[PDB]
Structure 1
Amino acid sequence: HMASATINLSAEKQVIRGFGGMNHPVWISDLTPQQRDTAFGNGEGQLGFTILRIHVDENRNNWSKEVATARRAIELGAIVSASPWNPPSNMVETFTRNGVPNQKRLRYDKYGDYVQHLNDFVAYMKSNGVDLYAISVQNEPDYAHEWTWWTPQEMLRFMRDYAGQINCRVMAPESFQYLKNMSDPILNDPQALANLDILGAHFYGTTVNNMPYPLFEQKGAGKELWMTEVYVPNSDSNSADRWPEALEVAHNMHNALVEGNFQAYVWWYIRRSYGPMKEDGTISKRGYMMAHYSKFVRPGYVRVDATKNPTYNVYLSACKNKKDNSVVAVVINKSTEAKTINISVPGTSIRKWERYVTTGSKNLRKESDINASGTTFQVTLEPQSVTTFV
């Protein structure tokens, strides 16, 4: 016996929008000129990110701080999305939430004023060379101990009655854990849904069984699905090179793509001691896990149906470039054993497969090509490894 996986290039799933991370030049230091290139270029030694997330500061005097990094990302081919943490203080009021006093929410009489704030940010960025791809209603409205809370009902009212006035794609609701109670009302209201452009979600503590979303599959035509913030499996200091811990990053991305049908996967801080880029400006193990997807599965490629878990501890995803029907497969082997599988790609003309491998001891190493037996390809996966086949 040898386990088999089949990649079905005719069974198209979601179109990939891209991968990236956060810049926050108010809370932490901005990316440097070199770091911007390492993040958003796709050359040797670069992450290949194509999505930058930024924050919408409540104080407009901080907006200028975003511009250089956002513009450089765009020069390098990325798109930029922005999320607010709080409205300006003159729009906020306090309330008691589950017995905890002094919590913040948007005043019910300030929904229109909040639209204007968001539009002012969009306009400021446009005036300074940054055409935002999208703007969000609220970062983590359901985990707002340290920012602004929105109930599902409040979020729905905004999406239904106000968000059509926003001069940008609208992203919502960015639940901290992809809690469907925050998004169901939007999807179930035709006007709110019409005003939505991107269903955004974070993945903190989101289990695999909570990654599918039948209601979105039913109602989300013409809407994008983005995982707009996570770090996994922790934010421990100086953890970004830990192995085999870093394989959790690859596995989480596999799960987002295959179990969640996500079109985008966006880390928290790009440069951080637990992030994809270390403080010394070089790529971490966690960053190489991202790169196995980001450098190869380019915007516009389409995920296809493929045997997702062909043998225990082995996870496989595949995407296709519609321009030439070429294929990118990302295969994770979490076992301490080597694993040999057959990969069948019926109907492909491809016969030579290149492979790049990361383990605890090498990063995106180009290994020997594999020559196919017709439309089947036999591959031995090193222990505790990620391999991208192209």
Structure 2
Amino acid sequence: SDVTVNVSAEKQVIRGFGGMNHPAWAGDLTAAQRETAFGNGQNQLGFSILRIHVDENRNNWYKEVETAKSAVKHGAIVFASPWNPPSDMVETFNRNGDTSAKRLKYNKYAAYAQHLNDFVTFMKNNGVNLYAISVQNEPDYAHEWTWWTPQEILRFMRENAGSINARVIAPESFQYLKNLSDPILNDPQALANMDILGTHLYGTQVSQFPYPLFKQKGAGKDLWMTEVYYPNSDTNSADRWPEALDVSQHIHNAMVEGDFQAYVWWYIRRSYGPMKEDGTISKRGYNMAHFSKFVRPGYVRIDATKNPNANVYVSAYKGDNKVVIVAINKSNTGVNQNFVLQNGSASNVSRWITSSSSNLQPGTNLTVSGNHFWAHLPAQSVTTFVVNR
């Protein structure tokens, strides 16, 4: 059919795409791997965001620095997520019959705010201006870390988040369970101390991607997808095709349905991650690259016919005089797609394709006839068009 791309219907502003680094749990990236992750050259990922963790023990903080420095050097922004407070701030409690359940002590909130602040300060003294810090990773799924109820999160956002010398991300539900975030959005004071609503999407159905309340109360707030792997963490799955195509479809849904402004993967380097263990880019990686390499920080999502044929998914962005279109064909049949540009005129179109047999591989240039151009979308393929204005 037709894909209409309206250059004037502006949507969310994009902050970027990236992944996690965890030297303790995964092993720090090597110098070469840092180039592959944050460089936007040929055979590199052009990740524009790096997540790192706030260790509960300050003596471990130093381990995050080299990789974080590297990301900044390349223009990536860095943010951080805590799993646990320092142990002296944590108590056990009876959570519905589970007595091993950990939480932050009600009289330790201020001290934990200071812990987080110390990390910001520490990172600064090593030449990393942390873009943002989180309150707690997955407080509603904390079997192996620190639990917070919605009300405990609220109290901290009302009373302590304001003392944090950085942008504050909250609440980082594992599944984008609105009940964890509703209380904040419904409280002027807590809302005021939140700069980024953060979430994960483990098991989240596409119908739960929209967030009406956020649209209603969240003016001036960022909306970030701070952790995921998809569609699984199967050992050595990173190269499986057409499986990898799920990655770009997921990002498509985050951008188009969730209106997210950041998409952050889990471990950058892993047998199921964007980067393989030999330090090369996986098929999952190239699926991310179709966004990360072209949709730079600052770009804006624009309205575009999201799903103009069965298994064909489209999203568009504008920035730096270009329109970027990402077209995912998940079917077993090549389709010819017609792309119409409204409220804007263009000339030349470049493109890169990823399929069973190729990675981000240049296609033939195409030219705009009036306000449109035809392009063929190979079977089980992702294409990124770059349109010059």
1:52 match: secondary structure:
strand
2:2 match: secondary structure:
strand
Residue 8 (structure 1) aligns with: 6
Residue 168 (structure 2) aligns with: 170
Task: Please tell me the residue identity of whatever aligns with 1:232.
Answer: Y
Task: Please tell me the residue identity of whatever aligns with 1:351.
Answer: S
Deviation of 1:348 after TM superposition, in Å, equals: 2.5
Q: For 1:193-232, list aligned pairs within 5 A.
A: 193-232=191-230
Give the Cα separation in 1 of the matches to 2:148 and 2:356: 43
Deviation of 1:376 after TM superposition, in Å, equals: 1.0
Q: Among residues 255, 277, 281, which one is paired with 1:283 in the alignment?
A: 281
Q: For 1:1-390, list aligned pairs within 5 A.
A: 3-321=1-319, 323-324=320-321, 326-390=322-386
Q: What stretches of structure 1 of length at least 5 have no aligned partner? A: none
Deviation of 1:367 after TM superposition, in Å, equals: 0.6
Q: Are 1:347 and 1:375, in contact at CA under 8 Å, matched by a contact in 2? A: no
Deviation of 1:168 after TM superposition, in Å, equals: 0.6
Give the Cα separation in 2 of the matches to 1:207 and 1:377: 34
Normalised by the size of structure 1, how large is the TM-score?
0.98
Which shifted more, 60-69 or 365-374?
Answer: 365-374
Give the Cα separation in 2 of the matches to 1:330 and 1:389: 6
Task: Please tell me the residue identity of whatever aligns with 1:213.
Answer: Y
Q: Please list the CA deviations of residues 133-154 of structure 1 after superposition, one character each: whole Å capped at 9, or x if unmatched.
A: 0000000000100000000000
Q: Are 2:89 and 2:108, in contact at CA under 8 Å, matched by a contact in 1? A: yes
Q: Are 1:351 and 1:375, in contact at CA under 8 Å, matched by a contact in 2? A: no
Give the Cα separation in 1 of the matches to 2:18 and 2:378: 27
1:109 match: secondary structure:
coil
Give the Cα separation in 2 of the matches to 1:100 and 1:106: 16
Q: Are 2:8 and 2:343, in contact at CA under 8 Å, matched by a contact in 1? A: no
Deviation of 1:380 after TM superposition, in Å, equals: 1.1
Deviation of 1:277 after TM superposition, in Å, equals: 0.3
Give the Cα separation in 1 of the matches to 2:185 and 2:238: 37
Q: Please list the CA deviations of residues 341-382 of structure 1 after superposition, one character each: whole Å capped at 9, or x if unmatched.
A: 211002332122111000010000101111222111111100
Q: Please list the CA deviations of residues 141-196 of structure 1 after superposition, one character each: whole Å capped at 9, or x if unmatched.
A: 00100000000000000001110000110000000011111111111100101000
2:237 match: secondary structure:
coil
Give the Cα separation in 2 of the matches to 1:351 and 1:336: 31
Deviation of 1:98 after TM superposition, in Å, equals: 2.2
The sequence identity of aligned pairs, in percent, is 71
Give the Cα separation in 2 of the matches to 1:317 and 1:242: 24
Give the Cα separation in 1 of the matches to 2:304 and 2:6: 6
Q: What stretches of structure 2 of length at least 5 have no aligned partner? A: none
1:261 match: secondary structure:
coil
Give the Cα separation in 1 of the matches to 2:26 and 2:286: 23
Task: Please tell me the residue identity of whatever aligns with 1:95.
Answer: F
1:218 match: secondary structure:
helix
Q: Please list the CA deviations of residues 192-222 of structure 1 after superposition, one character each: whole Å capped at 9, or x if unmatched.
A: 0100001110011111101001111111111
Give the Cα separation in 2 of the matches to 1:351 and 1:175: 44
Task: Please tell me the residue identity of whatever aligns with 1:214.
Answer: P
Number of positions where the alignment pairs a residue of Structure 1 with one of Structure 2? 386
Deviation of 1:109 after TM superposition, in Å, equals: 0.7
Normalised by the size of structure 2, how large is the TM-score?
0.98
Give the Cα separation in 2 of the matches to 1:308 and 1:160: 38
Q: Are 2:47 and 2:76, in contact at CA under 8 Å, matched by a contact in 1? A: yes
2:78 match: secondary structure:
strand
Give the Cα separation in 2 of the matches to 1:115 and 1:131: 18
Give the Cα separation in 1 of the matches to 2:241 and 2:46: 22
RMSD: 0.7
Give the Cα separation in 2 of the matches to 1:74 and 1:355: 28
